[PDB]
Amino acid sequence: PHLVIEATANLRLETSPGELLEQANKALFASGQFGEADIKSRFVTLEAYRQGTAVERAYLHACLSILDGRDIATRTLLGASLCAVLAEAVAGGGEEGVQVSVEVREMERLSYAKRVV
């Protein structure tokens, strides 16, 4: 699976990006749905961003892409698990609360290619 975490530049985290990614991988691994070496995560900081039309804001968004063929309970729980990890890593940012969210999307399985060099 692939996990992409996008944070705004003005977001302050409790931990470094490194640490957050490690926690996220532990949380995903612990779900029992993935092989250890398959979980690939990456952290991205956004410098050009805007939230809404109105006030300084910050946000954190993650998107987990998994291969398809899982049920809704599994996807919902993976979402809930990561969201909690991400949320606890937020110290704050901007002048309002920080929205944290997680999308869990499925990748078509039959067409997915994978090779190891």
């Binding site: 612990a30 809704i72 309970a73 809930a80 698990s81």
Partner: protein, 140 residues
């Protein structure tokens, strides 16, 4: 009062009752956890029985189970074992299998009515917690 709504509540009731029995075979700490679980199940039943009109469990409850799961995974080292290593662990393995049955019924409801996704996630996490608690008893 649609067939799957009724059946799912039925199963959740059955789950709660089995937990109610198991809690008399565990220590004070696990008993407290199991009582919290029985309360959460009632919230789930409210939501399902009312077809989403009544709010169910919050995201806090799922987060709570996940924290317990990590706590216990750290203390559990398994190869393959059969269910019921001790009498007390057996009771939790039975509860686990029922939680999975409850999940299957809840998922049917989710698929047809669009409700209960968090409930299903909770039940899924619950079946993982019950597994670990059983193993912990056998280990200890």
């Amino acid at each position: 009062k649609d067939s799957p709504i009724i059946e799912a509540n039925g199963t959740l009731d059955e789950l709660t009752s089995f937990i109610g029995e198991a809690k008399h075979y565990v220590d004070e700490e696990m008993k407290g956890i199991l009582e919290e679980i029985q309360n959460d199940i009632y919230k789930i039943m409210g939501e399902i029985g009312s077809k989403g009109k009544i709010e169910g469990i919050s995201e806090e409850r799922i987060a709570w189970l996940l924290k317990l799961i990590l706590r216990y995974m750290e203390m559990v080292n398994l190869s393959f074992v059969l269910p019921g290593g001790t009498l007390e662990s057996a009771k939790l393995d039975v509860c686990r299998t029922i939680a999975r049955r409850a999940l299957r019924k809840v998922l049917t409801v989710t698929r047809e009515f669009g409700i209960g996704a968090e409930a299903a996630a909770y039940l899924l996490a619950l079946s993982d917690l019950l597994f670990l608690l059983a193993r912990v008893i056998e280990i200890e």
